[PDB]
Amino acid sequence: KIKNPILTGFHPDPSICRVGDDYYIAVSTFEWFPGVRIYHSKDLKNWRLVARPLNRLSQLNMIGNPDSGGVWAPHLSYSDGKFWLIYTDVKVVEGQWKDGHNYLVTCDTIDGAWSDPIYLNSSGFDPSLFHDEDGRKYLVNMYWDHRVDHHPFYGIVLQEYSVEQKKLVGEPKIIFKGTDLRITGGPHLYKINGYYYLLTAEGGTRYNHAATIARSTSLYGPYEVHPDNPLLTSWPYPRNPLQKAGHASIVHTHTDEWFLVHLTGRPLPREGQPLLEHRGYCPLGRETAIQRLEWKDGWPYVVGGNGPSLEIDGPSVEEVSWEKDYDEKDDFDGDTLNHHFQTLRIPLGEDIATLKARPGHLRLYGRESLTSRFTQAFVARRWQHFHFVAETKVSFRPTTFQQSAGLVNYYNTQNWTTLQITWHEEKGRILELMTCDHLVVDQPLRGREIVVPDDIEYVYLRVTVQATTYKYSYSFDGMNWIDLPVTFESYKLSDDYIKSRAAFTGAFVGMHCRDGSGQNNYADFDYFLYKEL
Amino acid sequence: KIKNPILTGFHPDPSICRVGDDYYIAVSTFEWFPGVRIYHSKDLKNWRLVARPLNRLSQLNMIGNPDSGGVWAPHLSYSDGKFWLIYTDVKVVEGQWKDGHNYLVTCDTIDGAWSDPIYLNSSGFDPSLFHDEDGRKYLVNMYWDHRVDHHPFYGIVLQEYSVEQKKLVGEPKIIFKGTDLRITGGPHLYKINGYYYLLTAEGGTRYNHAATIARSTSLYGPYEVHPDNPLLTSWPYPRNPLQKAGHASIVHTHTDEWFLVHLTGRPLPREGQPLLEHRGYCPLGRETAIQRLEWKDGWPYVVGGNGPSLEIDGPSVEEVSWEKDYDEKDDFDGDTLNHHFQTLRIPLGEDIATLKARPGHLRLYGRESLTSRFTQAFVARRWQHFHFVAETKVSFRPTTFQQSAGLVNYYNTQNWTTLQITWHEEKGRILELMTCDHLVVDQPLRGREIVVPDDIEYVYLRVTVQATTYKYSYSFDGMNWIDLPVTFESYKLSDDYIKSRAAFTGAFVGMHCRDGSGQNNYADFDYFLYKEL
Amino acid sequence: KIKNPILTGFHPDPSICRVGDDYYIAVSTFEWFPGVRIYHSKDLKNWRLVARPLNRLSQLNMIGNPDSGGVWAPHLSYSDGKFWLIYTDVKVVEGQWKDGHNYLVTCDTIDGAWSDPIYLNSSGFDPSLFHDEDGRKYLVNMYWDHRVDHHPFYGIVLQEYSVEQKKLVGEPKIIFKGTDLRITGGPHLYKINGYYYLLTAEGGTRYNHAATIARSTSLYGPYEVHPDNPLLTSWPYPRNPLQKAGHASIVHTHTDEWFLVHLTGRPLPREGQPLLEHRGYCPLGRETAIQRLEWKDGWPYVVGGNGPSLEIDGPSVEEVSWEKDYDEKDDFDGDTLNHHFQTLRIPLGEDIATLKARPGHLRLYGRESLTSRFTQAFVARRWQHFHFVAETKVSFRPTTFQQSAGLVNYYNTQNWTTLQITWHEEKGRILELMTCDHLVVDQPLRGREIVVPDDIEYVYLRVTVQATTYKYSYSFDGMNWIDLPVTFESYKLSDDYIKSRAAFTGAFVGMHCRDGSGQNNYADFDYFLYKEL
Ligand SMILES: O[C@@H]1[C@@H](O)[C@H](O[C@@H]2CO[C@@H](O)[C@H](O)[C@H]2O)OC[C@H]1O
Numbered sequence A, B, C: 001k002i003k004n005p006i007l008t009g010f011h012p013d014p015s016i017c018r019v020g021d022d023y024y025i026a027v028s029t030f031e032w033f034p035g036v037r038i039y040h041s042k043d044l045k046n047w048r049l050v051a052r053p054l055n056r057l058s059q060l061n062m063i064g065n066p067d068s069g070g071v072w073a074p075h076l077s078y079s080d081g082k083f084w085l086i087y088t089d090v091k092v093v094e095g096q097w098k099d100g101h102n103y104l105v106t107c108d109t110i111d112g113a114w115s116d117p118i119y120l121n122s123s124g125f126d127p128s129l130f131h132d133e134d135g136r137k138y139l140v141n142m143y144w145d146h147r148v149d150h151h152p153f154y155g156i157v158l159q160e161y162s163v164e165q166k167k168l169v170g171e172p173k174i175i176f177k178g179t180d181l182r183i184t185g186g187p188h189l190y191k192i193n194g195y196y197y198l199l200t201a202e203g204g205t206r207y208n209h210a211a212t213i214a215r216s217t218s219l220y221g222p223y224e225v226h227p228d229n230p231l232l233t234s235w236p237y238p239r240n241p242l243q244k245a246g247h248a249s250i251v252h253t254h255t256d257e258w259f260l261v262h263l264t265g266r267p268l269p270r271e272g273q274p275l276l277e278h279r280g281y282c283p284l285g286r287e288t289a290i291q292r293l294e295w296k297d298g299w300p301y302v303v304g305g306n307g308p309s310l311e312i313d314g315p316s317v318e319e320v321s322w323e324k325d326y327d328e329k330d331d332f333d334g335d336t337l338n339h340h341f342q343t344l345r346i347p348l349g350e351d352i353a354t355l356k357a358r359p360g361h362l363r364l365y366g367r368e369s370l371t372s373r374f375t376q377a378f379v380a381r382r383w384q385h386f387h388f389v390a391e392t393k394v395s396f397r398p399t400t401f402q403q404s405a406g407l408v409n410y411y412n413t414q415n416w417t418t419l420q421i422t423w424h425e426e427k428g429r430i431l432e433l434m435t436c437d438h439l440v441v442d443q444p445l446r447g448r449e450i451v452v453p454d455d456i457e458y459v460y461l462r463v464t465v466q467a468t469t470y471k472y473s474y475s476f477d478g479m480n481w482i483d484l485p486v487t488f489e490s491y492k493l494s495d496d497y498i499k500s501r502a503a504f505t506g507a508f509v510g511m512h513c514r515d516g517s518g519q520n521n522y523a524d525f526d527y528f529l530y531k532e533l
């Protein structure tokens, strides 16, 4: 029935929520705006985007945020007639500190106007709100130890949240230090039977990733660990197509069945490479997958063993599939950009991105460069398949080399490639390739750039991705296409390639316009095409 | 019965050879002279050094060799009334190449004058000589592939060796590519029942290490792999005290039992550290362990699952214990230096190291610095326990800062610490500390060096090693000791700490004298003590 | 008249020697064998090589020597009817130490059998022998300070050399600490007027290089510095074609004229580059130039300022031109090799390099990779011009990818390029490009290798160098040439590009053959062509 991953491309830290016979997953969005993506399902198999809750500056202001900062794992729950969303804005993602702030927002409906944030704490990321049977609410998060002689993951801290007072109350207490796997985060609490079950993520979000579960009769512990822990992990299964299985949440379905959503990375093909030396590169980033649970001796178990199964049986419900929610060829005739498009860190107002200036086109007024953590005129969507074609059609008249417009495949500010239109002193309006690898820039088509003739209004830019490699191509008529003679490698746009390890997103493809001269020169994009191949 | 490791401290690549009821293990020695250690046992439990075969420059000329170059995995066998020892002198240990040459030497007895080398080939390291039931001989080794977009371990080459012609004959053929573990080396062949069994090391000599075994009716294959491969590995057993289990050889006893010797690394205590993030630091280098095999369906299995056991049951023989073969406190009264002492790269003649010049003393005439791959007046023995004291008592009168004498804990030319006597312009004869970490030198007693009174003939130098840390101390009278207020970390002298990854030896403790001026100044060492705990 | 440089290409540290009206310049050769290159002139304008004195293993044993180790600045003098050559063998060229030994060899003639070496000291490099007017002989050299808190160049040490005893006698003493430029080496003593004069190299052998002169009535000092020091430097003159001026030696000619030879680097074109940011790359390495001296107030001065002049006025003699000492196209018809080809570290015997085994061809028997500091089957000559073509015609039949033969542009073991013949599993015998940039290897023609058909017996290999860039080209007939579509860059084979700063030689061009398999496969080189363009 259900093939994994259920959410493909960039979809980490899945937090699942049941409301009656409705099902929701919220995933982390990091530096991409708006914050948080919530998907809905009736059968746990088919999923559609229904909410992007953190869409106001008052809720989320990520200007300047480092790559892989911002919205880390979110927590979605429902209680007392409303949804509760807990989220972090992480400001520091390298070194001894992980400075970041936890906030609560609520809404009556999944896609309404969510509240302005209530500040919770800053002690660590992976905040989760637990609603206990007595009406009392509790926040769990990881507690961060910055000290040099110390492992940073100090364990799971718990504190009561007062809905009345709109603040944490009493004293924070450590309830669980984790197992020897350490890197203990992603805590979620469940009152099942006579027990509080504490689900955590351990071993880090790379190849040693795991989901650990423990249980106690006291909310404050101590928690005895699952006798066959890890509950879930891909570490001992180097040939499993689904790696990095961890950061899970549990769902007890209305049909009295149990499932476990978790993140996973799907490495590119690795034939002829040493199985264990390096375990792979994931351009799709961390995706969402689902597993069935079964119960033995007051403990949950993953069906099929503690590794992730590629395919599982769904709950005992009627299949409810969803109509496609984007046009493969999006001609920009809508009044609002399709919801699979995101922007970097900030919302882009009509002064930067507009569907109104020239009907049927997305107009991007040129802002800062592809290396900027501030204001980029960039509108992008996820890679959601290993095999796809993405394509745009743009009219652009750059009068200086400080101006550019193109199709970009982007991981972060220091890691991207692009086929762009720019201006050159002798050659005039030109097409070039530009790549950035850990801030180091290459122009592989120097000085051999494609001269664009004066009488061409639109340049058509395309990328074809084929798993390990991809290629750019262009047309001046949309019919006769010419490949650019550089073969690019998809692993360079993957989490695993990034030297900082603050690499928690995934590859995007989008439309960019830079104007470094500050003359407000703009690009008109007639369509954006994304098509699985 | 048998507790592992059986060869403690730096003892990798164990090649076991049975002759009647005598058992011999040859281990690799790399840059340390002389080349190869051969231990003897009657019972596979108690082992005694009996041979150091590569002890002439005609056999082994390693001056200038890189750290962890020189004598890699050796192979010891017995056939046609003599011992055959195959060895490599590896010259290049970093980069796309691994330039290194294979040699055969023979001797009628284990501890006699071995022959001058017969040059075999250079196609790759881990050479092994197979003696076939029909009286024909074949060489196997790994085949190196230097190419940019190619895994270096091209598989296992085989070629016949002509005993009469003192050379390899026919054409060389690849008989085995390996499993998806790759990094296929350490090939050994055995004719058992109807099959040729080919044993290889795979996964590389760090934590992914494994012994792989395959069989064929044809010497030239194709070889079918063991259905439950690896034969041996520590990889899935992160809590196992014995890690890096691989590079094995098989012994069939005279009692009709089966064992497998293999190398292993014992990480320093890691309490509080993530189990899988980094799997540890091994200052004792790679040690030799032994596992019991049994046979099932024409395949050998390691008794106790495919991970290494700490304690096994030895063969059905009477125990033969050996007397201690070194003095805890070596007073240097003998005519030859104890065989646990080695020198770097080359033999030191009486002009450099002598027990004759000053009765009851080892005299070292100062040569080059601790960073020299050429001529060092350095006499050193292995760290063989996690807890020990080592101590010397030295008479030395430096006239310049270019001269030093001291006690050194040493991994390689670029990684070592020392408590040494030298000379200062203002202070004169001083005792100081010096460290070198990846060539970076520090002097922790900078400006507060211990002034040695002129009326002091002997400075006593001590290191106390307690697992993760160690501490130097000194005395002028040999009864009253003073700690130097610096705590050192043993992990900095471990395989795993070395950035070059050409890190194949282990920590040594020894006596050193430098004379950077060339005035042939010398240090007289009255004794050298080594004591567990 | 005399246009600089006089010795183009790799010719650093010139030591000039007058014999009546004959003039000799010795230069450092570092890892290139045989050691030291002496030139001869009558006019100071025209120079032919006459002697390569250190050509027995007894005098110079450099196998395993680090790149830019071996023979540093040499000292040539004449006294009591014999030549005197003082040289170092430097073993350690990185870190806190510079382990190295100073030797003396003598000869009745320039080109005879120089004696076996007399060991002097090891206290530091740049040794220099001073023959005092009273028959005593004194050695000066730099004194090395290894200490972390200290500047390495401790000053100039002086000790007397007893000719009869063939050793240094008395106590060594520092006679000069240097100026604020520091890095004080290259000491040369001259007794002129009533004063002893001390000439030193200061500021390092890069763009801060300078020649410093001082004087003292006494031999032990204190020496007072030239009131307009430096005597020679290119530091304050960034637009000067001749950079890095220093490490001088004085000649007083029979026509009562004073001249100063020195090393110099000539940076590649730097048009449109910032003047002072990086001062350039010198692929021809450090070359030899001459400047004229005058006298004022007992101090020597360089004519035209303390900056080097591109052209000078030579001595008052009749021009003695020399016959070209090498063939433009060298068909290898002689029974020994042209004295302009050197070997790496060691002499190459008949078993590796031979002109005897094949009439009219240089047979190179394949040995270790281009990254080996041990046994390379490699015969090479200096780049000596910015514009040239080198070329060879090679017969080679590789049976494996482990075998290579070709045309190499080489700086050291880790920085080189080649066009070479090798074997491929599918494509058979092939032509390929290979680069090595600080050990990182590229193959710019991967899957685009030239298939060499089996009816071709000779492949033609050509490099064409044009200042900043160079190209390789091949031919099967020697008439129709095809450029391989890669433009290489000359600055990557310069002294200044080497990250380690132990970069003291220069670009070389040569013929290589590797046999990684150890089968003694061989390349026959029909001719080698060096031709200025
Ligand atoms: O919210 C999630 C985090 O819980 C997760 O935790 C760790 C952050 O530091 C990294 O070095 C570790 O590898 C990682 O496990 O990071 C991912 C984020 O989605």
Ligand SMILES: O[C@@H]1[C@@H](O)[C@H](O[C@@H]2CO[C@@H](O)[C@H](O)[C@H]2O)OC[C@H]1O
Pocket (backbone or CB within 6 Å): B012, B013, B028, B072, B073, B125, B126, B183, B185, B186, B201, B203, B204, B205, B206, B247, B501, B504
């Ligand atoms: O002879 C032994 C070899 O079998 C082995 O070689 C490999 C060298 O590179 C490393 O990355 C691999 O891990 C290692 O297996 O170890 C060296 C020597 O002991």
Ligand SMILES: O[C@@H]1[C@@H](O)[C@H](O[C@@H]2CO[C@@H](O)[C@H](O)[C@H]2O)OC[C@H]1O
Pocket (backbone or CB within 6 Å): C012, C013, C028, C072, C073, C125, C126, C183, C185, C186, C201, C203, C204, C205, C206, C501, C504
């Ligand atoms: O023999 C010559 C040296 O005297 C000379 O001087 C210095 C050697 O150490 C390096 O760190 C400095 O940069 C250099 O100036 O250069 C080498 C040799 O030609």
Ligand SMILES: [Ca+2]
Pocket (backbone or CB within 6 Å): A330, A331, A332, A333, A360, A361, A525, A526, A527
């Ligand atoms: Ca449109």
Ligand SMILES: [Ca+2]
Pocket (backbone or CB within 6 Å): B330, B331, B332, B333, B359, B360, B361, B525, B526, B527
């Ligand atoms: Ca004694």
Ligand SMILES: [Ca+2]
Pocket (backbone or CB within 6 Å): C330, C331, C332, C333, C360, C361, C525, C526, C527
């Ligand atoms: Ca010829």
